Design an enzyme around this catalytic site. Structure first.
Site, PDB file in Angstrom:
ATOM      1  N   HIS A  76       0.821  -1.223   0.000  1.00 43.27           N
ATOM      2  CA  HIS A  76       0.000   0.000   0.000  1.00 43.27           C
ATOM      3  C   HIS A  76       0.855   1.274   0.000  1.00 43.27           C
ATOM      4  CE1 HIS A  76       0.200  -0.080   4.578  1.00 43.27           C
ATOM      5  NE2 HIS A  76       0.225   1.228   4.372  1.00 43.27           N
ATOM      6  N   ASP A 100      -0.079  -7.685   1.522  1.00 41.11           N
ATOM      7  CA  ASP A 100       0.318  -6.274   1.541  1.00 41.11           C
ATOM      8  C   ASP A 100       1.830  -6.109   1.599  1.00 41.11           C
ATOM      9  OD1 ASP A 100       0.036  -3.514   1.410  1.00 41.11           O
ATOM     10  OD2 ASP A 100      -0.352  -3.288   3.561  1.00 41.11           O
ATOM     11  N   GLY A 156       2.879   6.689   8.756  1.00 41.85           N
ATOM     12  CA  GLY A 156       4.138   6.714   8.064  1.00 41.85           C
ATOM     13  C   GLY A 156       5.142   5.691   8.538  1.00 41.85           C
ATOM     14  N   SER A 158       4.341   2.206   8.486  1.00 43.07           N
ATOM     15  CA  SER A 158       4.173   0.934   7.805  1.00 43.07           C
ATOM     16  C   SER A 158       5.482   0.559   7.119  1.00 43.07           C
ATOM     17  CB  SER A 158       3.026   0.990   6.804  1.00 43.07           C
ATOM     18  OG  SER A 158       3.351   1.732   5.643  1.00 43.07           O
TER      19      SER A 158
HETATM   20  C1  LIG Z   1      -4.203  -3.216  -3.713  1.00 46.08           C
HETATM   21  O1  LIG Z   1      -3.338  -3.482  -2.624  1.00 46.08           O
HETATM   22  C2  LIG Z   1      -3.613  -2.731  -1.484  1.00 46.08           C
HETATM   23  C3  LIG Z   1      -4.024  -1.253  -1.612  1.00 46.08           C
HETATM   24  C4  LIG Z   1      -4.322  -0.438  -0.356  1.00 46.08           C
HETATM   25  C5  LIG Z   1      -4.213  -1.125   1.021  1.00 46.08           C
HETATM   26  N1  LIG Z   1      -4.508  -0.324   2.217  1.00 46.08           N
HETATM   27  C6  LIG Z   1      -4.392  -0.992   3.493  1.00 46.08           C
HETATM   28  O2  LIG Z   1      -4.630  -0.331   4.704  1.00 46.08           O
HETATM   29  C7  LIG Z   1      -4.435   1.095   4.544  1.00 46.08           C
HETATM   30  C8  LIG Z   1      -3.237   1.603   4.683  1.00 46.08           C
HETATM   31  C9  LIG Z   1      -2.869   1.255   6.138  1.00 46.08           C
HETATM   32  C10 LIG Z   1      -2.109   2.133   6.941  1.00 46.08           C
HETATM   33  O3  LIG Z   1      -2.517   3.210   7.322  1.00 46.08           O
HETATM   34  N2  LIG Z   1      -0.819   1.601   7.375  1.00 46.08           N
HETATM   35  C11 LIG Z   1      -0.064   2.349   8.364  1.00 46.08           C
HETATM   36  C12 LIG Z   1       0.854   3.407   7.835  1.00 46.08           C
HETATM   37  O4  LIG Z   1       1.615   4.066   8.471  1.00 46.08           O
HETATM   38  N3  LIG Z   1       0.662   3.528   6.439  1.00 46.08           N
HETATM   39  S1  LIG Z   1       1.599   4.732   5.789  1.00 46.08           S
HETATM   40  O5  LIG Z   1       3.053   4.526   5.925  1.00 46.08           O
HETATM   41  O6  LIG Z   1       1.191   6.014   6.390  1.00 46.08           O
HETATM   42  C13 LIG Z   1       1.146   4.916   4.061  1.00 46.08           C
HETATM   43  C14 LIG Z   1      -0.374   5.011   3.760  1.00 46.08           C
HETATM   44  C15 LIG Z   1       2.150   5.676   3.195  1.00 46.08           C
HETATM   45  C16 LIG Z   1       2.049   4.151   3.099  1.00 46.08           C
HETATM   46  C17 LIG Z   1       0.535   1.644   9.591  1.00 46.08           C
HETATM   47  C18 LIG Z   1      -0.555   2.695   9.784  1.00 46.08           C
HETATM   48  C19 LIG Z   1      -0.451   3.977  10.632  1.00 46.08           C
HETATM   49  C20 LIG Z   1      -1.495   4.687  11.082  1.00 46.08           C
HETATM   50  C21 LIG Z   1      -2.967   4.300  10.832  1.00 46.08           C
HETATM   51  C22 LIG Z   1      -3.628   5.532  10.159  1.00 46.08           C
HETATM   52  C23 LIG Z   1      -5.124   5.278   9.910  1.00 46.08           C
HETATM   53  C24 LIG Z   1      -5.313   4.084   8.919  1.00 46.08           C
HETATM   54  C25 LIG Z   1      -5.856   2.844   9.681  1.00 46.08           C
HETATM   55  C26 LIG Z   1      -5.915   1.567   8.827  1.00 46.08           C
HETATM   56  N4  LIG Z   1      -6.470   0.580   9.701  1.00 46.08           N
HETATM   57  C27 LIG Z   1      -6.964  -0.624   9.099  1.00 46.08           C
HETATM   58  O7  LIG Z   1      -7.074  -0.770   7.903  1.00 46.08           O
HETATM   59  O8  LIG Z   1      -7.249  -1.592  10.063  1.00 46.08           O
HETATM   60  C28 LIG Z   1      -7.684  -2.809   9.486  1.00 46.08           C
HETATM   61  C29 LIG Z   1      -6.589  -3.993   9.125  1.00 46.08           C
HETATM   62  C30 LIG Z   1      -6.109  -4.336  10.392  1.00 46.08           C
HETATM   63  C31 LIG Z   1      -5.709  -3.622  11.705  1.00 46.08           C
HETATM   64  C32 LIG Z   1      -7.227  -3.955  11.432  1.00 46.08           C
HETATM   65  C33 LIG Z   1      -8.426  -3.410  10.484  1.00 46.08           C
HETATM   66  C34 LIG Z   1      -4.505   1.322   8.327  1.00 46.08           C
HETATM   67  O9  LIG Z   1      -3.617   1.148   9.114  1.00 46.08           O
HETATM   68  N5  LIG Z   1      -4.284   1.358   6.870  1.00 46.08           N
HETATM   69  C35 LIG Z   1      -5.248   1.571   5.905  1.00 46.08           C
HETATM   70  C36 LIG Z   1      -3.979  -2.459   3.594  1.00 46.08           C
HETATM   71  C37 LIG Z   1      -3.827  -3.097   4.953  1.00 46.08           C
HETATM   72  F1  LIG Z   1      -3.396  -4.383   4.784  1.00 46.08           F
HETATM   73  F2  LIG Z   1      -2.833  -2.376   5.536  1.00 46.08           F
HETATM   74  F3  LIG Z   1      -4.960  -2.982   5.685  1.00 46.08           F
HETATM   75  N6  LIG Z   1      -3.688  -3.243   2.431  1.00 46.08           N
HETATM   76  C38 LIG Z   1      -3.813  -2.570   1.141  1.00 46.08           C
HETATM   77  C39 LIG Z   1      -3.497  -3.402  -0.119  1.00 46.08           C
END
Ligand SMILES: COc1ccc2nc(O[C@@H]3C[C@H]4C(=O)N[C@]5(C(=O)NS(=O)(=O)C6(C)CC6)C[C@H]5/C=C\CCCCC[C@H](NC(=O)O[C@@H]5C[C@@H]6C[C@@H]6C5)C(=O)N4C3)c(C(F)(F)F)nc2c1
Ligand SMILES: [Zn+2]
EC number: 3.4.22.-
Length: 198
Positions: A76, A100, A156, A158
């Site tokens: 992601h 992911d 940020g 992940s």
């Molecule tokens: C086509 O392929 C795909 C396309 C899109 C996808 N989008 C996916 O999720 C998205 C992104 C990920 C995220 O925010 N990551 C972090 C981060 O820092 N990202 S990041 O670096 O900023 C960044 C976005 C720059 C990269 C660690 C988080 C930090 C803070 C949270 C902020 C609030 C968000 C809360 C949400 N909560 C949730 O979904 O909880 C559910 C799953 C599990 C815990 C429970 C329910 C969550 O965390 N996210 C939502 C996933 C998944 F696999 F990650 F879900 N796969 C995909 C596969």
């Protein structure tokens, strides 16, 4: 139309989390302008060090973690993108949207974490701000924060590692479980799943 079709840039290493001493801290190694240029060319001549890299695309920033000679991150964040390197863009060697997860050969000069075989549930999450957050393992891919905090603090990070007490890699941070914006728990890609992919 075909003549104007653009290519997405590479992921670019812009920093690292220094874990080499007694104090963890973030270091920036490239500014936003140089990141933009390196993303387009795919050519990054900077020296890479350490286990946890801070990486960026034109639109997102997140982390990537070297384990057993592979730099791993989340799909992601990276999609199918190449990563910039001294000799140009490097194609992913692992891609698994179902987990992911993506991975590239670890950069020349990185250090790798060793996959954990301790079977311990006392973990530590390393964030992009170099916070080391105790996390109790609660299942194959979930852990609870001992001290919950707003999700803002985890955004940020992940691609970052969860580590055991001995500093081995237990997993890659994927997502945060938010209740009224407070992260009480996190989901992660277990290192066994990376080892299977390998
Ligand atoms: C086509 O392929 C795909 C396309 C899109 C996808 N989008 C996916 O999720 C998205 C992104 C990920 C995220 O925010 N990551 C972090 C981060 O820092 N990202 S990041 O670096 O900023 C960044 C976005 C720059 C990269 C660690 C988080 C930090 C803070 C949270 C902020 C609030 C968000 C809360 C949400 N909560 C949730 O979904 O909880 C559910 C799953 C599990 C815990 C429970 C329910 C969550 O965390 N996210 C939502 C996933 C998944 F696999 F990650 F879900 N796969 C995909 C596969
Ligand atoms: Zn261990």
């Amino acid at each position: 139309h075909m003549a104007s079709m653009k290519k997405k840039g590479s992921v670019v290493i812009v920093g690292r989390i220094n874990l080499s001493g007694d104090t963890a801290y973030a270091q920036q190694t490239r500014g936003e302008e140089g990141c933009q240029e390196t993303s387009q060319t795919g050519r990054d001549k900077n020296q890479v060090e350490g286990e946890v890299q801070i990486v960026s695309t034109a639109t997102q920033t997140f982390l990537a973690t070297s384990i057993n000679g592979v730099l791993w991150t989340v799909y992601h964040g990276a999609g199918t993108r190449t990563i910039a390197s001294p000799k140009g863009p490097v194609t992913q060697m692992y891609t698994n949207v179902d987990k992911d997860l993506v991975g590239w050969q670890a950069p020349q000069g990185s250090r790798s974490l060793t996959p954990c075989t301790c079977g311990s549930s006392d973990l530590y999450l390393v964030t992009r701000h170099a916070d080391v957050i105790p996390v109790r393992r609660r299942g194959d891919s979930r852990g609870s924060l001992l001290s919950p905090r707003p999700i803002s603090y985890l955004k940020g990070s992940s691609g970052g590692p969860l580590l055991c007490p001995a500093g081995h890699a237990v997993g890659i941070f994927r997502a945060a479980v938010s209740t009224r914006g407070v992260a009480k728990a996190v989901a992660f890609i277990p290192v066994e799943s990376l080892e299977t992919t390998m």
